[PDB]
Design an enzyme around this catalytic site. Structure first.
Site, PDB file in Angstrom:
ATOM      1  CE  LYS B  44      -1.830  -1.277   3.956  1.00  0.00           C
ATOM      2  NZ  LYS B  44      -1.108  -2.518   4.447  1.00  0.00           N
ATOM      3  CG  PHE B  85      15.910  -5.454   5.326  1.00  0.00           C
ATOM      4  CD1 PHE B  85      16.571  -6.678   5.197  1.00  0.00           C
ATOM      5  CD2 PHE B  85      16.172  -4.669   6.450  1.00  0.00           C
ATOM      6  CE1 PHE B  85      17.463  -7.131   6.185  1.00  0.00           C
ATOM      7  CE2 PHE B  85      17.067  -5.097   7.441  1.00  0.00           C
ATOM      8  CZ  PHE B  85      17.711  -6.326   7.311  1.00  0.00           C
ATOM      9  CG  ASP B  90       8.080 -11.379   9.781  1.00  0.00           C
ATOM     10  OD1 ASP B  90       7.009 -11.643   9.199  1.00  0.00           O
ATOM     11  OD2 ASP B  90       8.181 -11.443  11.052  1.00  0.00           O
ATOM     12  CG  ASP B  94       6.943 -14.661  11.140  1.00  0.00           C
ATOM     13  OD1 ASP B  94       7.451 -15.135  12.168  1.00  0.00           O
ATOM     14  OD2 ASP B  94       6.657 -13.416  11.092  1.00  0.00           O
ATOM     15  NE  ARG B  99       4.827 -10.265   3.656  1.00  0.00           N
ATOM     16  CZ  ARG B  99       4.530  -9.954   4.917  1.00  0.00           C
ATOM     17  NH1 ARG B  99       3.642  -8.978   5.156  1.00  0.00           N
ATOM     18  NH2 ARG B  99       5.136 -10.593   5.937  1.00  0.00           N
ATOM     19  CG  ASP B 161       7.517 -11.891  16.639  1.00  0.00           C
ATOM     20  OD1 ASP B 161       6.398 -11.444  16.285  1.00  0.00           O
ATOM     21  OD2 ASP B 161       7.920 -12.952  16.113  1.00  0.00           O
ATOM     22  CE  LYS B 185       5.114  -8.134  16.078  1.00  0.00           C
ATOM     23  NZ  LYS B 185       4.548  -9.364  15.405  1.00  0.00           N
ATOM     24  CG  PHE B 224      -0.386  -0.594  11.630  1.00  0.00           C
ATOM     25  CD1 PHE B 224       0.624  -1.509  11.284  1.00  0.00           C
ATOM     26  CD2 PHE B 224      -1.190  -0.072  10.608  1.00  0.00           C
ATOM     27  CE1 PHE B 224       0.799  -1.898   9.945  1.00  0.00           C
ATOM     28  CE2 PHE B 224      -1.020  -0.462   9.261  1.00  0.00           C
ATOM     29  CZ  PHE B 224      -0.027  -1.373   8.929  1.00  0.00           C
ATOM     30  CG  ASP B 228       0.022  -7.615  11.197  1.00  0.00           C
ATOM     31  OD1 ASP B 228      -0.004  -7.530   9.951  1.00  0.00           O
ATOM     32  OD2 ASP B 228       0.663  -8.520  11.794  1.00  0.00           O
ATOM     33  CG  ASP B 229      -1.064  -9.257  16.315  1.00  0.00           C
ATOM     34  OD1 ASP B 229      -0.207  -9.310  15.374  1.00  0.00           O
ATOM     35  OD2 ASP B 229      -0.759  -8.926  17.490  1.00  0.00           O
TER      36      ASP B 229
END
Ligand SMILES: CCCCCCCC[n+]1ccn(CC(O)(P(=O)([O-])O)P(=O)(O)O)c1
Ligand SMILES: CCCCCCCC[n+]1ccn(CC(O)(P(=O)([O-])O)P(=O)(O)O)c1
Ligand SMILES: [Mg+2]
Ligand SMILES: [Mg+2]
Ligand SMILES: [Mg+2]
Ligand SMILES: [Mg+2]
Lengths: 333, 333
Positions: B44, B85, B90, B94, B99, B161, B185, B224, B228-229
């Site tokens: 975005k 990056f 991540d 993860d 993505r 995290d 994070k 934010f 996201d969670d």
């Protein structure tokens, strides 16, 4: 000279760690200490020692106050942190097993791909220390830029190293390609970076003097990597602290390049059949073929020529720097 | 405001790429272009757009010459490069699949753990561009340090995290721990970094004004990440561009934290039994339990409160900055 300073150097690590180690981030900070102890200690410290040794040799003893020295060995440790960073990451990409006589950090139980964040943390420390100790020096920005430019060049070198060695794919393995790889991947950061760091700390920042030092140091870097390739196959893992992967990982090693240059057409097929494969039988066949063409002795030959060439280069380009700066480093390799 | 500037912003990407892309490194340079096109495009651009939008709003139009603007959107792209990056890396840590509506870069055939070097290359570009376009500005060092300090904080956040979510291990999942994680994070780099970048470009570098902006922006960052969670479980992957992994990866998600706070002892056991496991049946059981305690509505409640709180904070701390700087950003989330 390196050998006597090594002790002071390694002791100053405890302070690096105390200074690097907000009650909320406690655990993260404790994990940093652990990452450092495991990954910054255990090597030969050639690169960080070079900062301190060259510093001593380029600054007058009357300008070498206690604070001035503290900074030289901090920047020395910043270079070691760069190394530790590059190593942790290269071991994952290379699927290596041991480093510096122990299990690679990523192969430790309970670590794995977290090692990716660990490696970058090591890189972040360089800049924390630079700020901590050099923020008011007139070379501060020069050092920051040097360390960044040096990571970019060495990551460019990696890309080349990886693109030339696709998993599960020989025409690619030329001399021109090899020299190019080792220049970016190893020569800037292992050789130019530490001497240049000490040059900027001693107030020596002319373009001409940097380029002349560079001319010497890139060639030393190339030899060093060729040595690294040789020891990957023909070195004792009890001494190197690491197990080789170059043939398995399908690498543009110096060994494979020379071999190609030497091989009967039939021998070319043996290499094609066996190279870049995980099978121990096939690796041994490639090793046997390198021994069949006396590459250990070709390596001993090259090592001598290249040493002569480096010495000629010091004679041409050291002035006005003390030649001992360079001789000391060349003797340690 | 963001919506109209988005076009100019995305067009300027071609120039970023031409300027970033020594005939010897050719292949490496071509691989960089590919890494950029795949990983810098498709999001975005909230974060990079914020640099440009806030720049416009804080500099007088008479100081907004063409060169001045070029730099604002270059620094805008530097922030996007930071993002790219962090994302590439991540996704590996993860074990994510998609993505931005495509396969994660590391899951592409023929890429895998090479993605580690690709990610860091993206980070190296930030500093190449900073040198290219801002080396003679008086804010140059401020920007360099900001981007470095921002990576260190966000890598510290990652450590937290990862340490809080060991593979194959709930008492750990507290409010205090959660707030701490999301602050480091996400909040520094996604929110403070872009506004502060534009502040330094507009000559505004007082400690007090940075801290006041920070007070607003860290709280926006926390909201934010909680968003996201939430979207990780209850968002449409056709819209988010990404598949959730939080329960599988045993994460200190906002959802798991609230749940815990709400759970009958028996419900606590259902969570204990099923959380942090790769089995789809067990993930669904956890999702069912979150729906059983109306967490989607608790999330809609929290979103409203927190928005009020952010607005109160703008009213307290925006001066002397235009409140529109902050309102514009809050409206886009
Ligand atoms: C984050 C991107 C940074 C990547 C770091 C690349 C550094 C170049 N480099 C030089 C030497 N090594 C170690 C070796 O693996 P070896 O010490 O023999 O293990 P190599 O032979 O692969 O070259 C790595
Ligand atoms: C090199 C060390 C840098 C590591 C980068 C850490 C950045 C923090 N961060 C914030 C968001 N994401 C993406 C997530 O995976 P989501 O976009 O939901 O995928 P997350 O939920 O893991 O937080 C990552
Ligand atoms: Mg390697
Ligand atoms: Mg090697
Ligand atoms: Mg994550
Ligand atoms: Mg998430």
């Amino acid at each position: 000279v390196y050998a006597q300073e090594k002790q002071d150097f390694v002791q100053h690590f405890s302070q690096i760690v105390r200074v690097l180690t907000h009650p909320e981030i406690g655990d993260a900070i404790a994990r940093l200490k652990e990452v450092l102890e495991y990954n910054a200690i255990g090597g030969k410290y050639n690169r960080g020692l070079t900062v301190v040794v060259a510093f001593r040799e380029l600054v007058e003893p009357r300008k070498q106050d206690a604070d001035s020295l503290q900074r030289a060995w901090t920047v020395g440790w910043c270079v070691e942190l760069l190394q530790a960073f590059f190593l942790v990451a290269d071991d994952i990409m290379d699927s290596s097993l041991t480093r510096r006589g122990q299990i690679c950090w990523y192969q430790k139980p309970g670590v794995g791909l977290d090692a990716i964040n660990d490696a970058n943390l090591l890189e972040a420390c360089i800049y924390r220390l630079l700020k901590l100790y050099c923020r008011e020096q007139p070379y501060y920005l020069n050092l920051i830029e040097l360390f960044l430019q040096s990571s970019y060049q060495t990551e460019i070198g990696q890309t080349l190293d990886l693109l030339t060695a696709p998993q599960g794919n020989l025409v690619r393995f030329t001399e021109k390609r090899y020299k190019s790889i080792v220049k970016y991947k190893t020569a800037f950061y292992s050789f130019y970076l530490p001497i240049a760091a000490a040059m900027y700390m001693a107030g020596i920042d002319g373009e001409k003097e940097h380029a002349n030092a560079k001319k010497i140091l890139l060639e030393m870097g190339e030899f060093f990597q060729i040595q690294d390739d040789y020891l990957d196959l023909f070195g004792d893992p009890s001494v190197t602290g690491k197990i080789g992967t170059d043939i398995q990982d399908n690498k543009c090693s110096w060994l494979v390049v020379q071999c190609l240059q030497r091989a009967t057409p039939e021998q070319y097929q043996i290499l094609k059949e066996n190279y870049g494969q995980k099978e121990a039988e096939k690796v041994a066949r490639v090793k046997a073929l390198y021994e069949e063409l006396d590459l250990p002795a070709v390596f001993l030959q090259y090592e001598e020529d290249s040493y002569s060439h480096i010495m000629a280069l010091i004679e041409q380009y050291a002035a006005p720097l003390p030649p001992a700066v360079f001789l000391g480093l060349a003797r340690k390799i």
